[PDB]
Amino acid sequence: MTHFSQQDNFSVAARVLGALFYYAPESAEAAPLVAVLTSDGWETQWPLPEASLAPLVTAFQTQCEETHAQAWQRLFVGPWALPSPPWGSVWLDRESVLFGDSTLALRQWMREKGIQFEMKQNEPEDHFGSLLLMAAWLAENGRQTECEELLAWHLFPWSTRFLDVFIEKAEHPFYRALGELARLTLAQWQSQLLIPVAVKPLFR
């Protein structure tokens, strides 16, 4: 009876995932989250079965020669091409551009629903981490339907594909592990949906 966005740490889990995909690991936003996931205890509070997180607990604490910051820069910033670009219209748009037709559909939906959540200036709204942060934002605000529509229509149609390629191309134990946690967690959320995920063709 209680909506899944309002229980079992939905907003909490969506923020951790959202922040680690959007902010650099040394940042004020992400560093405390990096510390949490690289330490014992986080598995007890995360909304998945503890035994099924056990490999991730170990994975996150696997030591590596490449630093978290170097991995993050390589994967999310540049200067060279990103292995798995975290913007939705890269996956949903025929021409695979940023600020695509799917980005516009997201923008119009936000407008109609009077959602005042704004991204950084010059940034598209369809960043993977941004959308999770917005979803947590709506959940905190009790906006159940909007949270459900966000995920079903604007995130889940492309996020599984992005995560499949991202996990494959992470090449860093921490960020590979983050990808797998995101895939499991979002797949669990997808199964709790009361409206179906929008089926859209992928071009990447």
Asked whether 160 and 137 are in contact (CB, 8 A), the reply is no
Asked whether 134 and 117 are in contact (CB, 8 A), the reply is yes
Give the whole-angstrom CA distance, residue 81 versus residue 145: 36
Q: Which residue has the tokens 């951790």?
A: 16
Give the whole-angstrom CA distance, residue 16 versus residue 33: 7
What DSSP letter does each residue of the chain carry, written as one string?
Answer: ---GGGSTTHHHHHHHHHHHHHS-TTSTTTHHHHHHHTSTTGGGTSSS-HHHHHHHHHHHT---SS-HHHHHIIIII-SS--SS--BTHHHHSTT--SS-HHHHHHHHHHHHTT------TT--TTBHHHHHHHHHHHHHTT-HHHHHHIIIIIIHHHHHHHHHHHHHH--SHHHHHHHHHHHHHHHHHHHH-SSPPP------
| Residue type for position 64 | C
Name the class of domain 1-204: mainly alpha
Measure the CA angle with vertex 18, ends 17 and 23; round to 5°.
Answer: 105
Give the whole-angstrom CA distance, residue 175 versus residue 44: 20
Q: Where are the beta strands (DSSP E) in 107-151?
A: none
68: number of CA atoms within 13 Å, CB side? 22
Q: Say whether the peptide bond before residue 47 is cis (omega within 30 degrees of 0).
A: no
CA distances from 98 to 50, 77, 113 (A): 38, 15, 23
Going by C-alpha positions, the residue among 149, 148, 145, 68 that lies closest to residue 106 is 149
CA distances from 103 to 96, 114, 125, 127 (A): 11, 16, 7, 9
The domain locations on the chain are: 1-204
Identify the experimental approach: X-ray
Asked whether 89 and 99 are in contact (CB, 8 A), the reply is yes
Q: Where are the beta strands (DSSP E) in the chain?
A: none
Going by C-alpha positions, the residue among 90, 79, 171 that lies closest to residue 128 is 90
